[PDB]
Amino acid sequence: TIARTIVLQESIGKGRFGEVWRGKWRGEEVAVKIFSSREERSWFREAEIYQTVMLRHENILGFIAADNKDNGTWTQLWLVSDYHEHGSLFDYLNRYTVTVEGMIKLALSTASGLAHLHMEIVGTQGKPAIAHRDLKSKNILVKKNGTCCIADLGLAVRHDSATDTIDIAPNHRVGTKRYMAPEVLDDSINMKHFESFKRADIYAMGLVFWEIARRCSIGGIHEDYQLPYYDLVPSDPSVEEMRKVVCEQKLRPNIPNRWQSCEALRVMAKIMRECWYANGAARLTALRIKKTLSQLSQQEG
Numbered sequence: 001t002i003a004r005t006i007v008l009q010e011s012i013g014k015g016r017f018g019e020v021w022r023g024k025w026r027g028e029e030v031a032v033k034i035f036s037s038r039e040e041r042s043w044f045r046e047a048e049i050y051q052t053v054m055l056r057h058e059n060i061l062g063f064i065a066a067d068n069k070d071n072g073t074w075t076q077l078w079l080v081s082d083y084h085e086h087g088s089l090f091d092y093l094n095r096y097t098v099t100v101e102g103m104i105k106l107a108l109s110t111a112s113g114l115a116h117l118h119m120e121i122v123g124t125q126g127k128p129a130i131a132h133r134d135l136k137s138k139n140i141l142v143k144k145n146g147t148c149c150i151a152d153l154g155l156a157v158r159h160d161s162a163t164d165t166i167d168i169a170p171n172h173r174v175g176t177k178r179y180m181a182p183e184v185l186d187d188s189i190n191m192k193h194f195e196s197f198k199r200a201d202i203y204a205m206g207l208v209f210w211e212i213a214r215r216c217s218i219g220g221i222h223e224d225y226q227l228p229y230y231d232l233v234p235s236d237p238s239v240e241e242m243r244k245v246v247c248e249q250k251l252r253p254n255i256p257n258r259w260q261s262c263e264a265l266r267v268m269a270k271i272m273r274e275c276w277y278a279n280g281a282a283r284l285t286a287l288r289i290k291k292t293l294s295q296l297s298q299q300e301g
């Protein structure tokens with residue numbers, strides 16, 4: 001009844017997996033992700049993560065539905081969600097620069113979002129903890145009101161506190177190598193302990209903060225948009241190329257000394273460093289970041 005009443009209108013972006021279309025449902029715009037068949041190894045999974053959990057949060061892409069429309073003629077598996085015109089944060093930051101206020105808004109929303117993803121609520125109608133495993137600029141969307149919501153939860157992993165086990169994801173591809181935390185690049189991570197996934201999620205978010213802050217324009221001064229490590233690795237970096245940079249050379253994205261001439265950038269800069277520790281156990285938690293960013297938010301307005 002759902003996919004059936006939806007009319008596709010335009011291609012909004014290509015996902016290394018599938019792609020997205022802006023559709024129309026009962027007078028409203030909606031985003032629809034259609035799976036390339038062989039890409040099913042993620043349709044059910046992505047549907048599952050968006051469903052099996054009580055993941056309703058203003059900072060997490062609002063899930064509408066999943067409809068098996070395997071065409072009596074061909075393969076059409078749908079994923080229907082809310083539609084955010086601005087698109088990915090990556091697109092956003094590439095096209096615009098931001099105010100100090102915008103920067104906080106963006107970084108706070110993202111943090112509160114992952115904080116909710118990571119939070120476990122044990123009990124009757126509880127909620128299992130969730131680690132994203134592929135947090136990056138391209139998998140975060142910016143809404144009309146200037147706040148973010150996490151997306152592309154296809155590679156996420158759910159922690160079963162009852163049995164302290166991990167509901168593994170059924171697929172044949174890990175995450176984006178450019179954002180892989182150190183313990184993941186050197187393969188020392190204990191993928192059997194859920195905390196490690198959240199810690200890796202954190203390192204990745206710090207990189208995203210770096211991308212946002214570089215675009216915070218004050219006095220007309222800001223840096224061009226650049227991905228983390230643009231100055232140290234080629235496009236589509238390999239594990240080897242990242243590991244030598246992040247693990248051997250112990251190099252992190254550069255923090256302009258000017259980011260200390262502004263309170264908000266001084267804080268963001270502090271959070272970044274505290275997310276990039278080689279030792280995940282020493283990194284800040286998403287809840288913690290939300291708190292400090294929240295406190296910095298009220299101060300600014």
Ligand SMILES: c1ccc(-c2n[nH]cc2-c2ccnc3ccccc23)nc1
Pocket residue numbers: 012013015020031032033061079080081082083084085086087088139141151152
């Ligand atoms: C169903 C439908 C789309 C998506 C989606 N995956 N990645 C980004 C979006 C997205 C989600 C919402 N609005 C957008 C707007 C522009 C570009 C991408 C998006 N996922 C499931």
